[PDB]
Write a protein that binds this ligand. Structure first.
Ligand code: NAD
Ligand code: NAD
Ligand code: NAD
Ligand code: NAD
Ligand code: GLC
Ligand code: GLC
Ligand code: GLC
Ligand code: GLC
Ligand code: MG
Ligand code: MG
Lengths: 255, 255, 255, 255
């Protein structure tokens, strides 16, 4: 069956995506910086009858990404979809932004996506066909969010890469799209809430409260809500879609 | 089974959407101004082993839309999705636009969508649950297309309606989204090409050639390509998406 | 020597635009269907040393718009800029939208803009040069606003017209742009607030307070803020800008 | 008189902006990594009757940007506007992108803007008032351009920073906007065309001609066209505008 590699699949949205893709019929490579959670997710999948393999990789490292993609391609017998999902999101008061903070966020969120794109392109060529590249964006990648200058800008960058890649890779039978979540219940958001709440000298949940006011559907997102959109982007039903970054955010930003 | 009503389902994109929804498991109401084609499509669906009913309706007439929706709800045993697909697309040289031309296009493309939204809202309420409203937009509803002032503006209006409706109806558990095709092989585009070519003093095909140049995927769209996107919008996989007008245009416009 | 015609110039934003354009050096035609206010504004301008003429016109009527533009062109001795500013904005709960309401709003907001574009195109042609067409849009023309389905969709339509016109008329040396205000202190907003507040059973000001929450700059808009943006759109400094609908809304929507 | 600092003002768009701001009445700090051109431009301004000072700075370095702003603030007697204009734009075939290429482009284009924002914020606070931050974006910052993955994404990031900054800094009476040029006749574009043409094995001018096909106005941009837009963004007429990245690209992208 078809093969997909999902980065940051050890937990949160990445894990949800991996599980959904397995349900969709994909054999999946669980790629993550965290060896323990990657193996835990791969095990959960295999225990339920699916086909998964854990792959340790730091997406900020170009050679590691290529190695991860090739390992998955050889082991799973193919390569049809890559989901560049791994990412970090520290809240960043503008006056306190440092070169170190920018490097950390961009090396993972932006370079990681570029490396994933390149490795997938070569993998598709070696398999002798086209493919689907799916990147993790955010509604903050469409509209700069408050207190998230570095993160928001990194996601805008991902959307830019998504669009240029869609145009440049089209002749190779490759499409490039992205998914844009809103406020999702994962350790990532919990941390943003903590930083923003603490910085405002307010109780935990304050950040969630402020951002949740802009969610039209009136509830935070489940990782599965995002995975459901990614399922479409990994399916042939999205074959005629490219360069798009879909908002699966409960209606925070409208396009 | 879940129930959906598709306007303009007698042919083209509308018919393709209806057939795809049937494959997805929906009982479908084939709504069209053309009674003969609606009945033919419904018959085809029923003879094939699916469930459908044909309803004659001019979407520009509010009472006829409510009647069509209610007939579908009673006959099919429920109402879960409405696809306001019917539309017209005459090319309109700016200096030649008349109020008659504006009325013709807007009465179907804009008013028809408003009536569909209202009728669906009442059907959902009578059923005691939420629902999905899906509107036919166009890439021309995101970026004004040359020689298509009236058509483009009508689709921008449809997207505006889609967004306000998404915000106003969210409390009722109703989502409102749209699909934006590119250049689809149906009699609608055939006519635009003929009009644009003649006005330009160029042989037939000038329109297709000019617009086709912006399609990143380098191929024209099949009605089924659009139906594949609508399938997602009709599925529970789109539950957390609202107020979006997805581009399933082969990459003509990037969002 | 430059000439501009501003529709809906009898009060609010239109009047502010007219006065600013006069300060910028334009001879201005005060177009409005309100004879009293149009003549009062023209009088105010002429008494201060400026050059203006009042012109009676219901922008929903194509012939009247052409006649108004031609009267301005002949009386003021030229025609360089048209500002299609006149508009109406009733709040419209979705369930109660009627064909009459849609017609009232669209005949003024949408058709009025089309007639203005056409009339200006002919005027520029008769003057032997190009020109600037400026349309009144709204942040609600970029993102559908709650309780404003008909109004929002009409402004989305205006933006669509702005874009197609920009592309279609470029060869004639004509640019077409729009301005998008936020919450401006004029009788129009006061009425929206009254309608929304009444519908909700809230004291006057409820609507203003709710919509104001999204204004980044934390203050309501003055008609002069909008006039300052239009000044740019009417000046040669905007010569290389076309097809754009600028947000001069205090930061409600971001592009 | 008001004070403005323009990075990359030694040539191209930056020089044009500086000269226009001088005409508008500003005292300007010519900041550039090229000491020769910076002093040459400052010299031309002072000899012609204006007030300017050359400041050497590599915008990729945070400390240097702060030092440049402070030198400008002390020497020119104030600080009211900053134009983070400096930038680089290499064409980058996706398969050939290296971490080195990304760092070079992002350290200048993205970090440079962050440092400028921070330095400006502190300068404004020290001057005891608000201010205007203006960043150089590009139409490629709204839509990913072919063969320009790294450059396009860096400009998307700039827009992201522009938006978050506008929201975060609003309380300080600071607005943050950007300008988006199209194809401008400067050494930067000349180099992009050379790279793209050589890569395609086609004569010089190939890239220029291909990209120019998307310019609605049908003519290449002059640095002064961009400076004209920045003039508006530096003037009080843009006081009620924030978080916007205006397209002064001849109509390549429409918002
Ligand atoms: N949580 C949200 O609300 C939200 C909203 C929008 C977008 N997103 C995006 O969705 C993606 C998933 O976020 P999430 O909530 O699941 O985050 P998370 O923090 O819960 O999970 C991130 C995963 O990434 C892995 N990872 C981190 N750095 C890595 C690196 N250098 N190399 C490899 N793996 C690495 C982690 O081990 C972890 O399992 C991210 O790109 C995020 O920006 C999240
Ligand atoms: N064809 C394209 O390239 C393209 C691209 C973008 C968007 N769209 C949109 O997709 C939708 C379907 O277009 P299509 O190509 O299938 O068109 P089509 O002309 O092939 O089919 C339109 C259907 O609408 C029905 N219809 C027309 N007026 C009606 C009315 N007043 N009431 C009820 N039914 C009515 C017709 O009988 C017909 O079956 C439209 O909304 C169109 O704007 C089409
Ligand atoms: N007020 C706001 O908050 C706001 C925000 C965004 C956009 N706008 C837009 O700005 C424009 C000006 O709005 P405003 O607040 O000044 O409105 P307003 O109601 O205060 O003034 C409108 C003017 O239009 C004239 N007018 C109305 N219908 C007309 C017709 N058919 N023919 C000719 N003249 C006609 C009126 O006589 C009046 O002088 C409108 O297009 C409006 O949609 C206003
Ligand atoms: N030229 C175009 O067609 C075009 C289109 C869109 C956007 N832009 C943007 O406009 C801005 C100006 O571009 P341009 O055409 O004038 O470029 P240019 O290459 O002609 O001029 C750039 C200036 O930046 C200075 N500079 C470069 N790196 C620097 C650094 N690290 N620190 C300080 N100064 C540095 C250079 O010395 C030079 O004077 C850039 O941000 C560019 O991305 C240009
Ligand atoms: O940077 C280039 C990458 O792809 C190349 O094809 C090599 O096979 C791989 O080892 C390398 O990491
Ligand atoms: O009044 C608008 C519509 O809704 C009403 O409730 C009626 O049920 C329907 O016949 C009518 O067309
Ligand atoms: O018909 C549209 C308008 O333009 C025509 O060219 C005529 O000049 C004018 O009388 C008419 O009202
Ligand atoms: O940390 C960035 C800047 O912070 C302060 O402004 C310091 O005065 C300056 O020296 C430094 O470069
Ligand atoms: Mg803070
Ligand atoms: Mg190539």
């Amino acid at each position: 069956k078809k093969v997909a590699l999902v980065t940051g699949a050890g937990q949160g949205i990445g894990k949800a995506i991996a599980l959904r893709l397995v349900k969709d019929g994909f054999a999946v490579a669980i790629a993550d910086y965290n060896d323990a959670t990657a193996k835990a997710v791969a095990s959960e999948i295999n225990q339920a009858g699916g086909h998964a393999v854990a792959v340790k990789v730091d997406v900020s490292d170009r050679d590691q990404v290529f190695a991860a993609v090739e390992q998955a391609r050889k082991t799973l017998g193919g390569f049809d979809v890559i989901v560049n999902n791994a990412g970090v999101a520290p809240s960043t008061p503008i006056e306190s932004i440092t070169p170190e903070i920018v490097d950390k966020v961009y090396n993972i969120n932006v370079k990681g996506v570029i490396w994933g794109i390149q490795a997938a392109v070569e993998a598709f060529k070696k398999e002798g066909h086209g493919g689907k590249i799916i990147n993790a964006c955010s509604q903050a990648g469409h509209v700069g969010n408050p207190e998230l200058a570095v993160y928001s800008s990194s996601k805008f960058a991902v959307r830019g890469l998504t669009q240029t890649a869609a145009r440049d890779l089209a002749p190779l039978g490759i499409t490039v799209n992205g998914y844009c979540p809103g406020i999702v219940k994962t350790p990532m958001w919990a941390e943003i809430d903590r930083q923003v709440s603490e910085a405002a000298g307010k109780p935990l949940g304050y950040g969630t409260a402020e951002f949740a006011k802009r969610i039209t559907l009136g509830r935070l997102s489940e990782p599965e809500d995002v995975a459901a959109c990614v399922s479409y982007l990994a399916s042939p039903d999205s074959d005629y879609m490219t360069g798009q970054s879909l908002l699966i955010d409960g209606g925070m930003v409208f396009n």
